[PDB]
Structures are given as structure tokens and as C-alpha cells.
Amino acid sequence: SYVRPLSVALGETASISCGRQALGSRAVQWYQHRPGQAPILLIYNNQDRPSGIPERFSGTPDINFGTRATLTISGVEAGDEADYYCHMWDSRSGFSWSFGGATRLTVLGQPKAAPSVTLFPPSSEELQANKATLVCLISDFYPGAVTVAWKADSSPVKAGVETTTPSKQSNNKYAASSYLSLTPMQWKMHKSYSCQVTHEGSTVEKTVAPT
Amino acid sequence: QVQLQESGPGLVKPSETLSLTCTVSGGSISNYYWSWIRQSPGKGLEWIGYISDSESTNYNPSLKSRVIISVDTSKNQLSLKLNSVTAADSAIYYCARAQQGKRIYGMVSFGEFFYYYYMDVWGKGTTVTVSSASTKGPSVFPLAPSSGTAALGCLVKDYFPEPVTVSWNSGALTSGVHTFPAVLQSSGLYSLSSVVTVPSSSLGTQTYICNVNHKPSNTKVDKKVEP
Amino acid sequence: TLQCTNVTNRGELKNCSFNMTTELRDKKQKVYSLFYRLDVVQINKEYRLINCNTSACTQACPKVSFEPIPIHYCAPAGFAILKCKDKKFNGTGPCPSVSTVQCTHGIKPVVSTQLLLNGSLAEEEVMIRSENITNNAKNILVQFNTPVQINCTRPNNMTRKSIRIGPGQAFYALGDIIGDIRQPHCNVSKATWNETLGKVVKQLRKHFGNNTIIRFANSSGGDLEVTTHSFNCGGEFFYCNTSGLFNSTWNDSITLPCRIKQIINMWQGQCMYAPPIQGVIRCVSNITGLILTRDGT
Amino acid sequence: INKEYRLINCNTSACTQACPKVSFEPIPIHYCAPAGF
Numbered sequence: 001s002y003v004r005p006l007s008v009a010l011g012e013t014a015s016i017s018c019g020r021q022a023l024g025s026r027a028v029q030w031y032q033h034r035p036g037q038a039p040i041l042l043i044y045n046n047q048d049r050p051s052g053i054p055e056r057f058s059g060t061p062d063i064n065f066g067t068r069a070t071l072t073i074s075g076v077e078a079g080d081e082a083d084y085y086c087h088m089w090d091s092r093s094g095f096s097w098s099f100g101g102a103t104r105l106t107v108l109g110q111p112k113a114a115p116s117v118t119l120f121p122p123s124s125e126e127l128q129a130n131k132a133t134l135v136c137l138i139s140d141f142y143p144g145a146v147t148v149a150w151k152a153d154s155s156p157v158k159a160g161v162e163t164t165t166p167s168k169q170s171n172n173k174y175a176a177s178s179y180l181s182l183t184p185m186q187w188k189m190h191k192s193y194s195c196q197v198t199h200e201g202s203t204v205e206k207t208v209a210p211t
Numbered sequence: 212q213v214q215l216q217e218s219g220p221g222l223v224k225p226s227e228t229l230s231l232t233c234t235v236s237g238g239s240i241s242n243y244y245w246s247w248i249r250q251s252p253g254k255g256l257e258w259i260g261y262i263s264d265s266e267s268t269n270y271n272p273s274l275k276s277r278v279i280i281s282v283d284t285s286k287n288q289l290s291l292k293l294n295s296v297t298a299a300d301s302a303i304y305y306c307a308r309a310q311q312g313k314r315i316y317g318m319v320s321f322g323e324f325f326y327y328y329y330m331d332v333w334g335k336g337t338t339v340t341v342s343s344a345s346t347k348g349p350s351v352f353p354l355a356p357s358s359g360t361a362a363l364g365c366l367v368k369d370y371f372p373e374p375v376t377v378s379w380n381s382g383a384l385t386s387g388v389h390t391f392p393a394v395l396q397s398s399g400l401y402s403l404s405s406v407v408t409v410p411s412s413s414l415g416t417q418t419y420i421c422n423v424n425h426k427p428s429n430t431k432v433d434k435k436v437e438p
Numbered sequence: 439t440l441q442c443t444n445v446t447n448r449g450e451l452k453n454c455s456f457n458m459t460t461e462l463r464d465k466k467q468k469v470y471s472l473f474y475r476l477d478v479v480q481i482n483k484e485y486r487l488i489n490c491n492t493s494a495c496t497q498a499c500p501k502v503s504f505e506p507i508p509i510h511y512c513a514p515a516g517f518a519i520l521k522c523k524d525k526k527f528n529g530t531g532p533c534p535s536v537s538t539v540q541c542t543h544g545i546k547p548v549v550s551t552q553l554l555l556n557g558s559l560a561e562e563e564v565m566i567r568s569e570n571i572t573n574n575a576k577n578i579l580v581q582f583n584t585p586v587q588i589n590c591t592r593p594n595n596m597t598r599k600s601i602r603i604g605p606g607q608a609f610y611a612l613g614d615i616i617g618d619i620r621q622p623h624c625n626v627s628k629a630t631w632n633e634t635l636g637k638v639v640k641q642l643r644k645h646f647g648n649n650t651i652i653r654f655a656n657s658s659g660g661d662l663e664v665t666t667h668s669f670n671c672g673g674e675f676f677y678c679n680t681s682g683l684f685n686s687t688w689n690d691s692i693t694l695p696c697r698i699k700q701i702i703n704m705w706q707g708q709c710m711y712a713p714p715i716q717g718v719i720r721c722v723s724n725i726t727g728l729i730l731t732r733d734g735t
Numbered sequence: 736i737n738k739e740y741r742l743i744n745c746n747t748s749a750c751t752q753a754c755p756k757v758s759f760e761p762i763p764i765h766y767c768a769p770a771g772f
């Protein structure tokens with residue numbers, strides 16, 4: 001299943017049209033699915049909601065035929081960013097085995113927050129295990145996209161670094177790890193190791209030395 | 212009310228039976244419909260099949276010739292057995308209660324209705340990865356701070372497959388905790404890093420231990436953190 | 439030769455595509471249209487229109503109306519028409535109260551079957567007629583005194599599609615079904631039909647006995663136009679199974695499942711293709727008479 | 736059509752060729768009233 005992009009501003013009204021309009025009398029379901037999480041039944045009948053869904057989630061009933069099914073989100077929050085599916089049942093088409101396509105709502109105009117970089121030196125036990133690891137932890141940044149550079153003393157590293165793609169947090173900010181794997185001797189033969197995290201327009205540095 | 216919780220091997224070899232189960236709570240197993248839903252990375256929600264309060268079978272033609280959805284009413288338990296798995300079967304498998312709706316438009320006597328199904332309560336999801344690679348336990352390494360507010364955590368090196376569950380002081384330390392998503396290294400093993408922000412004044416009269424669990428390896432390890 | 443499939447959904451009306459002449463005699467067109475199964479038959483999927491082995495069909499002009507209009511019959515100069523103002527006058531005999539008229543009243547030529555629709559009621563009591571009532575092969579014309587309401591509808595929202603099949607020759611085809619597929623039917627109040635069937639059995643005892651049982655059954659079989667209440671509703675010809683009306687031995691809503699035809703012959707010969715009516719069809723009528731037939735407890 | 740041509744009437748109506756024996760010549764016509772008019 002492919003994804004349809006959508007962009008509403010914070011506090012506005014979202015109008016998510018169904019990608020598969022009905023041919024007869026319909027019974028449309030709306031599921032809110034955040035990736036890697038449990039889907040949320042927003043609206044099950046054409047217009048009915050379950051217990052625990054805000055009034056600001058509305059779905060169009062079919063009183064007269066011809067009105068296409070749409071999901072309306074009034075007063076959109078940042079937490080309303082998710083996948084939205086249109087489970088279309090109607091009297092003409094068969095059994096709705098497949099859910100909708102995918103409308104991924106991305107809310108514009110959120111507060112920009114700078115990351116919180118924290119670099120840890122290699123552990124004592126793993127250095128005793130003949131393997132070193134620099135762990136540069138980045139969190140609480142928006143918009144979720146950072147570039148990570150590693151400096152050995154003053155030379156760029158690039159070789160032997162893995163970096164996490166910015167996942168989302170419960171506070172609607174983003175987080176990403178960045179592991180630099182060093183040999184225990186390479187870690188001791190250098191003076192300092194820096195982690196450069198350039199978020200949006202600026203870079204932040206966190207350095208660590210073997211002492 | 213009703214809640215659900217899935218549980219599975221977490222890792223199944225290619226061309227094998229992917230057994231699974233789901234125990235419901237606060238609800239009777241024999242008076243509702245039950246749906247299985249999986250979701251792979253890059254793919255959308257896929258409806259596996261469903262079983263009725265009459266225990267009737269009906270599967271997605273997509274899979275059809277591989278699924279079998281059983282249910283045992285002695286407990287509140289219902290299973291799911293996909294076989295002949297391939298790489299494309301890696302997904303989070305969800306367990307939701309389907310409720311039957313009957314949409315009438317014309318005359319009920321002339322059969323001018325149709326039946327739809329909506330899932331109102333879901334399970335949390337069980338990750339299942341398929342690969343010939345063997346299981347693997349992690350190896351936690353401490354991450355010590357160095358001085359108002361400071362931070363410390365645990366480095367969960369080289370494990371397979373996803374995921375691992377990180378607790379702090381068996382569940383007591385739950386404020387300020389921040390567990391980061393994993394990293395699939397080119398060696399084929401994930402690595403995770405958890406970290407807690409803590410008032411540095413407590414770093415002397417307060418002990419901190421992280422609780423790491425990785426189910427596919429039957430491992431439960433702990434480690435202290437101190438300067 | 440028609441290439442027909444069902445309509446997605448119980449397999450009633452078909453979806454047929456066929457090569458067809460155009461306005462240019464050397465150009466063909468692959469066009470499609472819907473035909474109720476009562477208008478097509480198979481070959482051995484390949485179908486053919488029902489009339490093609492009997493006679494050609496003439497499509498009705500989509501401007502003429504099938505609406506019955508009150509017609510008055512008049513006698514020429516030197517002649518006269520005599521009315522019978524006897525409010526309890528069975529068909530034959532000597533009418534004691536006679537009046538002369540230049541013309542009859544407004545007669546609506548309602549083509550109907552089994553159930554006389556929109557007609558003239560009877561005063562006082564519900565009469566019954568027939569000739570030799572002891573002869574069972576003589577249809578009994580019963581005429582109600584109070585009307586029983588009947589409501590018919592074709593609920594499918596149909597589309598009309600003009601197919602240019604020649605210079606000026608345009609066959610109006612059946613496009614597709616907009617919205618729900620449903621079943622055309624008719625309604626009668628089971629209460630009003632109960633009290634009206636009770637009135638008919640009243641006068642039936644005056645000729646057959648105060649003790650004998652009076653059974654009602656459905657048609658004996660035969661043609662589609664005689665077995666079912668066939669009439670016209672908004673331009674399309676219905677064929678309603680009346681088995682739910684004559685099923686008695688002596689809020690409500692009795693429903694009659696009706697079919698729909700487009701190729702009707704009528705009386706004889708030569709046939710007519712009624713063009714499809716667009717939109718949702720529903721008509722409200724009074725059933726005022728009846729045409730019964732005793733078997734011969 | 737898009738050389739290929741077609742007669743102008745073929746999308747509106749068929750045409751009847753005039754009989755090559757009838758004349759289009761106007762003839763003096765006299766209109767008369769019936770008896771009593």
C-alpha cells in the first residue's frame with residue numbers, strides 16, 4: 001500500500017478524502033494508525049464514533065447518495081500526525097478485505113526545538129572486552145531531521161559510524177542515536193572525540209576524551 | 212472492559228509454521244468476532260482473517276492458502292498459524308475484536324443489506340522477523356555520568372532480533388527515562404541505548420540499575436551505573 | 439449476437455456488449471447496454487434478444503406518453519347512448535333507471551391484468567358480474583366499492599444512453615445503475631386488502647352458498663402477462679407476483695416482487711421496445727376491480 | 736473526419752433523393768372557399 005501526503009496547519013481543519021469512493025450505500029470506517037503502533041478506530045459507521053474519540057473527528061454520513069466519504073479533523077494537533085485509512089464497504093463492491101490506501105497527515109507550523117546531544121565514552125567492561133563504542137544520543141528536536149558528523153581530535157571520521165533515522169517521541173519531538181564503533185586502541189591513541197549534530201540551521205558539539 | 216495481548220516466537224525460520232496466540236481480558240471469547248492484522252515496513256495495514264462468535268473461518272484471498280485461525284474457548288485465547296513463511300511476512304501482528312455491522316439500504320426481506328466489520332479494541336502488537344539467522348542475546352554495558360542535572364544509561368550491544376524491553380529499577384524509576392530506537396549494524400545485529408536524566412544531587416544516595424529483557428534469547432540481565 | 443455478463447452483486451439484469459452499426463454504413467461500434475434477462479436468451483456467454491426469431495421490434499418514441507387519458511365515447515347524430523343509473527346493477531338484465539347521454543364519462547384506457555387499476559368504483563356495495571356464473575370458464579369481473587391503495591416502485595436509479603445506429607436512428611440504451619441495486623415491487627395495506635377481500639367473499643356467497651368455503655390461490659400458470667399483475671408504471675412494464683394477495687381461505691404492508699420487461703408484444707406479431715426511463719420510478723394507484731376464475735369447496 | 740469526408744446529413748437524418756421526374760416549377764395555385772363560405 002502506497003501513501004498519500006497531506007499537510008494542514010496547526011489548529012486548522014483537516015479534510016481527508018477517501019481514496020475509494022463508493023458505488024452504492026456505504027459503511028465507511030476510519031482508522032488512525034501511527035506507524036509501529038496499534039491502530040485507533042476513529043469512526044466505524046459512516047458517522048458514528050466509539051467511546052473515547054474527540055468530537056473534532058467527524059465523518060460524513062450518506063443520507064443522499066453522491067456525497068463522498070471524508071474524514072474531518074477540526075483543531076488539528078501535532079499528535080494528529082499519523083496514517084489514516086478509509087475502510088470502504090458498499091452494496092456494489094464485494095468484501096472490503098483491504099483497508100484504505102494511506103493518508104499521512106503532516107502538521108505544519110509546530111514549534112522548532114533544538115536537540116539535546118549527550119555523548120558517552122566507551123564503557124569500562126566493553127573496553128575490557130576489546131571493543132569500544134561512542135554513543136552520541138540526540139533527542140527532543142523538531143523538525144525531525146539531523147545530520148551527524150564525528151571528529152577524531154580534529155579529523156573527520158565517517159568510517160565505522162551508524163546513525164539512527166529520527167524516530168518520534170511521545171512529546172511529538174524526535175530522537176536519534178549515533179553509534180561510533182572504535183577499536184579499544186584507537187580510542188586511547190587519540191586526544192578527544194567530538195560529535196557534531198547539525199540540526200536545521202545550526203550545529204551542536206559534544207566532546208569526550210579518555211581520562 | 213476488554214484488552215488483548217499477543218505473544219509469538221518473535222523469530223521464525225523461512226518455510227515454517229508461524230504460530231501465534233492472543234489472550235483477551237475482561238471479555239468472553241465466544242460472543243464476539245476476532246480479527247488478525249499485520250503491518251510490514253513499507254506496506255500498509257493488511258487484514259489477515261477473522262473468526263466469528265460462531266467460530267466460522269474467512270481469510271484474505273491475499274494469503275488464503277496459508278492461514279488457519281483457530282480459537283480455544285477454555286481460556287480467552289485464540290491462535291493464528293501462518294505457514295510457508297517468506298521474507299515478506301515480517302510484520303507487527305495485531306489482535307483486534309471485530310464487531311459485526313449490518314448495513315440495510317433496501318428491503319431486509321429481499322436481502323438488500325450487506326455486512327461490514329469494524330475493530331474497536333486492539334492488541335498491542337507482536338513483532339515477528341523471518342530469517343535463516345539464529346537468535347542472539349545482548350550484552351549490556353554501563354554508561355556512567357560525570358556531573359545540578361546529569362544523565363546515565365545502558366548500552367545494549369549486538370542482539371537479534373528486535374526488540375528488547377528496558378526497565379529501570381524493575382519499574383520504579385519511570386520518570387525521565389528515554390529508551391532510544393535500535394540500530395541494525397552491517398553485522399546483522401541490533402544495538403539499543405537507554406538513558407535516564409537524574410538529579411545529580413541524588414548520585415550518591417540513590418542506586419540505579421537497568422533491567423534488559425530480550426525474549427527470543429530467554430535472557431534477563433542487569434547492570435549497575437556509577438562514576 | 440450479444441456478449442453478456444451479469445451485473446456485479448441476483449443475476450437478474452445483464453450487462454451485454456455488441457458490435458453495432460454507426461451513422462456511417464462502413465464503421466462499426468463496440469457498445470454495451472443492460473437488458474433484463476426476460477429480454478434475452480442464450481445460444482449454446484452469448485445471448486440474443488428474445489424477439490429476433492419471431493419479429494422485429496419498434497422502439498417507442500421517447501416523446502409519446504403511456505399515460506391513460508380520460509376518453510369519452512359519443513354517439514353520432516341520429517343515435518344515442520343510454521346510461522344505467524342502477525347502483526346495484528349486475529351486468530345483464532333490465533335497468534329500471536335509464537338516462538340518455540351524448541357521451542360516456544371519462545374512460546381511462548388503463549392496460550392492466552388481474553387487478554383493475556385506477557378505474558371507476560361502485561356505489562353502495564361491491565358488485566360482481568360474469569355471464570354464466572355457473573360456467574367456470576367465464577371470468578368474474580368484481581368491482582370494488584372502496585379503493586385499496588397500491589404503491590409500486592422501481593428503486594434502481596437508471597441511466598439512458600443514446601446509441602447512434604444510423605442517420606437519425608438513435609436507439610436509447612440502458613446505461614448503468616447509479617447507486618444501490620434494489621428490487622422493484624408493489625405494496626398494499628394488508629388491512630385494507632383484508633377488508634376488501636372480505637367484501638368480495640361476501641357477494642361470492644350469494645351465488646355459491648352461505649356454507650361453502652371460498653379459497654383464494656395464485657394463477658394456474660401460462661404466459662408471464664397473465665400469471666402476474668402486469669401494468670405500466672412511469673413508462674416501464676411491471677410483472678408483479680400476486681401470490682401474496684390471493685393466499686386465503688374463508689403497519690401491515692403486503693409486498694409483491696415485480697420483474698421488469700422491455701420487449702413486450704401485447705395482445706398479439708409485432709413487438710415494442712419501451713425505452714428505459716431515467717431516475718427512480720414510483721407510482722401510486724387505486725386497484726378498483728378484479729378478474730377472478732373459479733376452478734370447478 | 737480528422738482526405739476522408741462524409742455527407743453532411745449522416746449524423747442528423749437520412750436523405751431522400753428527389754424523383755428526377757417531378758418538377759420544382761411553381762404553378763399558379765388558386766385557393767377557393769367551400770359551399771356556404
Ligand SMILES: *[C@@H]1O[C@H](CO)[C@@H](O[C@@H]2O[C@H](CO)[C@@H](O[C@@H]3O[C@H](CO[C@H]4O[C@H](CO[C@H]5O[C@H](CO)[C@@H](O)[C@H](O)[C@@H]5O[C@H]5O[C@H](CO)[C@@H](O)[C@H](O)[C@@H]5O)[C@@H](O)[C@H](O[C@H]5O[C@H](CO)[C@@H](O)[C@H](O)[C@@H]5O)[C@@H]4O)[C@@H](O)[C@H](O[C@H]4O[C@H](CO)[C@@H](O)[C@H](O)[C@@H]4O[C@H]4O[C@H](CO)[C@@H](O)[C@H](O)[C@@H]4O[C@H]4O[C@H](CO)[C@@H](O)[C@H](O)[C@@H]4O)[C@@H]3O)[C@H](O)[C@H]2NC(C)=O)[C@H](O)[C@H]1NC(C)=O
Nearest residue numbers: 025046061062063311312313315316317318319320625691
Ligand atoms: C413497501 O414495502 C416495503 C416492505 O415493507 C418497504 O421496504 C422498506 O423500505 C425502506 C426504504 O426503502 C427501508 O428503510 C431502510 O431501513 C434500514 C434499516 O432500518 C432499520 O434498522 C436500523 C438499524 O437497526 C440497528 O440499529 C438500531 C439503532 O441504530 C437498533 O435499535 C437496532 O436494534 C439495530 O441494531 C441491531 O441490529 C443490527 C442489524 O441491523 C445489528 O448489527 C446490531 O448489532 C444490533 O444487534 C434502525 O436505525 C431503523 O430504525 C428507524 O426506524 C424506526 C422505525 O422502526 C424509527 O423509529 C426511526 O426512524 C429509526 O431511525 C430500522 O429499525 C435503514 O438502514 C435505511 O436508512 C438508511 O439507509 C439509507 C440508504 O442507505 C440512508 O439514506 C438513510 O439515511 C439511512 O442511513 C443512515 O443509517 C446508516 C446505517 O446506520 C448510516 O450508515 C448513515 O450514516 C445514516 O445515518 C444517518 O441517519 C440516521 C437516521 O437514519 C442517524 O441515526 C445518523 O446519525 C445519521 O444522521 C432505510 O430507512 C425498510 O427497511 C424496508 N422494510 C423492510 C422490512 O426491509 C417500502 O418502504 C414500502 N414502500 C415503498 C416501496 O414505497
Ligand SMILES: *[C@@H]1O[C@H](CO)[C@@H](O[C@@H]2O[C@H](CO)[C@@H](O[C@@H]3O[C@H](CO[C@H]4O[C@H](CO)[C@@H](O)[C@H](O)[C@@H]4O)[C@@H](O)[C@H](O[C@H]4O[C@H](CO)[C@@H](O)[C@H](O)[C@@H]4O)[C@@H]3O)[C@H](O)[C@H]2NC(C)=O)[C@H](O)[C@H]1NC(C)=O
Nearest residue numbers: 443444445446452453454455468469470471472613614615
Ligand atoms: C458493463 O460492462 C462494461 C464493459 O463492457 C463496463 O464498462 C467498463 O467499466 C470499467 C469499470 O468497471 C471501466 O474501466 C475503468 O476505465 C477507466 C477509464 O480509464 C481508462 O483510460 C485511461 C486514459 O485516460 C487509461 O490510462 C486507463 O488505464 C483506462 O484504460 C479507469 O479510470 C478505471 O481505472 C480504475 O481501475 C484501475 C485498475 O483497477 C485503478 O488502478 C484505478 O485507480 C481506477 O480505480 C477503470 O479501468 C471501463 O473503461 C468500462 N468500459 C467501457 C467500454 O465503458 C460497465 O461498467 C459495466 N456496467 C455494469 C452496470 O456492470
Ligand SMILES: *[C@@H]1O[C@H](CO)[C@@H](O[C@@H]2O[C@H](CO)[C@@H](O[C@@H]3O[C@H](CO)[C@@H](O)[C@H](O[C@H]4O[C@H](CO)[C@@H](O)[C@H](O)[C@@H]4O)[C@@H]3O)[C@H](O)[C@H]2NC(C)=O)[C@H](O)[C@H]1NC(C)=O
Nearest residue numbers: 064065066593594595596597615616617618716717718719
Ligand atoms: C440518480 O442519479 C443521477 C445521476 O446519475 C442523479 O442526478 C444528479 O443530481 C444532482 C442533484 O442532486 C446533480 O448535482 C447538481 O449538478 C448541477 C450541475 O449539473 C449543479 O449546478 C448542482 O449544484 C448545487 O445543486 C444542489 C441542488 O441540486 C445543491 O444542493 C448543491 O449545493 C450543489 O452545489 C448539483 O451539483 C447531478 O449533476 C446529477 N447528475 C447527473 C448525471 O445528472 C440523481 O439525483 C439520482 N436520483 C436519485 C433519486 O438518486
Ligand SMILES: *[C@@H]1O[C@H](CO)[C@@H](O[C@@H]2O[C@H](CO)[C@@H](O[C@@H]3O[C@H](CO[C@H]4O[C@H](CO)[C@@H](O)[C@H](O)[C@@H]4O)[C@@H](O)[C@H](O)[C@@H]3O)[C@H](O)[C@H]2NC(C)=O)[C@H](O)[C@H]1NC(C)=O
Nearest residue numbers: 505506548549555556669670671672673720721722723724
Ligand atoms: C393511476 O393514476 C395516478 C394518478 O393520475 C398515476 O400517477 C401519476 O403517475 C405519473 C407517472 O408515473 C406521474 O407523472 C410524473 O410526474 C412527475 C413529476 O410530478 C411532480 O411535479 C408536478 C409539477 O408539474 C406535480 O404536479 C406533481 O403532482 C408531482 O409533484 C415526474 O416523475 C414525471 O414527469 C411523470 O410525468 C403523475 O404525477 C402521477 N399522478 C399522481 C396524482 O400521483 C398512476 O401512474 C396511475 N397508474 C396507472 C397504472 O395507470
Ligand SMILES: *[C@@H]1O[C@H](CO)[C@@H](O[C@@H]2O[C@H](CO)[C@@H](O)[C@H](O)[C@H]2NC(C)=O)[C@H](O)[C@H]1NC(C)=O
Nearest residue numbers: 441442443444445448449450451452453483484
Ligand atoms: C449470473 O448469475 C447466475 C446465478 O449466480 C449464474 O447462474 C449459474 O449458471 C451456471 C451456468 O454456467 C449454472 O451451472 C449454475 O447452476 C447457475 N447458478 C445458479 C445459482 O443458478 C449465471 O451463470 C450468471 N451469469 C453470468 C453470465 O455469469
Ligand SMILES: *[C@@H]1O[C@H](CO)[C@@H](O[C@@H]2O[C@H](CO)[C@@H](O)[C@H](O)[C@H]2NC(C)=O)[C@H](O)[C@H]1NC(C)=O
Nearest residue numbers: 476478479480487488489490491492493661662
Ligand atoms: C423463438 O425462440 C424461443 C426461445 O426462447 C422459443 O420459445 C421456447 O421454445 C422452446 C421449444 O423450442 C420451449 O421449450 C420454451 O418453453 C419456449 N420459451 C418461451 C419463453 O417461449 C420460441 O418457440 C421461438 N419461436 C419461433 C417462432 O421459433
Ligand SMILES: *[C@@H]1O[C@H](CO)[C@@H](O[C@@H]2O[C@H](CO)[C@@H](O)[C@H](O)[C@H]2NC(C)=O)[C@H](O)[C@H]1NC(C)=O
Nearest residue numbers: 527528529530531532566567568569570571645
Ligand atoms: C343480473 O340480474 C338479473 C335479474 O335482475 C338476472 O336475470 C335472471 O337470470 C336467470 C339466469 O341466471 C334467469 O333464469 C332469470 O329469468 C333472469 N331474470 C330476469 C328478470 O331477467 C341475471 O342472471 C343477473 N346476472 C348475473 C350474472 O347473475
Ligand SMILES: *[C@@H]1O[C@H](CO)[C@@H](O[C@@H]2O[C@H](CO)[C@@H](O)[C@H](O)[C@H]2NC(C)=O)[C@H](O)[C@H]1NC(C)=O
Nearest residue numbers: 555556557558559584585586722723724725726
Ligand atoms: C383513488 O382514491 C379516491 C377514490 O375515491 C380518489 O380520491 C378521491 O376522489 C374523489 C373524486 O374526485 C374526491 O371527491 C375525494 O375527495 C378524493 N379523496 C381524497 C382523499 O383525495 C382518487 O382520485 C383515486 N385515484 C384514482 C382513481 O386514480
Ligand SMILES: *[C@@H]1O[C@H](CO)[C@@H](O[C@@H]2O[C@H](CO)[C@@H](O)[C@H](O)[C@H]2NC(C)=O)[C@H](O)[C@H]1NC(C)=O
Nearest residue numbers: 586587588589590624625626627628691692722
Ligand atoms: C402509498 O404511498 C402514499 C404516499 O407515499 C401513502 O400515503 C401517505 O400515508 C402517510 C401515513 O398515513 C401520510 O403521512 C402521508 O401524508 C401520505 N402521503 C400522501 C401523499 O397522501 C400511502 O399510505 C401508501 N400506501 C401503501 C399501501 O403503501
Ligand SMILES: *[C@@H]1O[C@H](CO)[C@@H](O[C@@H]2O[C@H](CO)[C@@H](O)[C@H](O)[C@H]2NC(C)=O)[C@H](O)[C@H]1NC(C)=O
Nearest residue numbers: 461602605606736741742743744745746747748
Ligand atoms: C452533425 O455534425 C455537424 C458537423 O458539421 C455539427 O455541426 C457543427 O457542430 C459544431 C460543434 O460540434 C459547431 O462548432 C459547428 O459550427 C457546426 N457546424 C454546422 C454546419 O452545423 C452538428 O452539430 C452535428 N449534429 C448532431 C445532431 O450531432
Ligand SMILES: *[C@@H]1O[C@H](CO)[C@@H](O)[C@H](O)[C@H]1NC(C)=O
Nearest residue numbers: 439440441455456457468469
Ligand atoms: C466485433 O467484431 C470483431 C471482429 O473481429 C470481434 O473480434 C469482436 O468480438 C466483435 N465484438 C463483439 C462485442 O462481439
Ligand SMILES: *[C@@H]1O[C@H](CO)[C@@H](O)[C@H](O)[C@H]1NC(C)=O
Nearest residue numbers: 569570571572573574575734
Ligand atoms: C352454464 O354452463 C353450464 C355448464 O357449465 C350449463 O349447463 C348451463 O346451461 C349454462 N347456463 C346458461 C344460462 O347458459
Ligand SMILES: *[C@@H]1O[C@H](CO)[C@@H](O)[C@H](O)[C@H]1NC(C)=O
Nearest residue numbers: 656657658659665679680681
Ligand atoms: C403458485 O403457487 C405455487 C405454490 O404456492 C408455486 O409453486 C407456483 O410457482 C406459483 N405460481 C405463480 C405463477 O405464482
Ligand SMILES: *[C@@H]1O[C@H](CO)[C@@H](O)[C@H](O)[C@H]1NC(C)=O
Nearest residue numbers: 656665666679680681682695
Ligand atoms: C410467486 O411467489 C411465490 C412465493 O412468494 C413463489 O413460490 C412462486 O414461485 C412465485 N411465482 C413466480 C412466477 O415466480
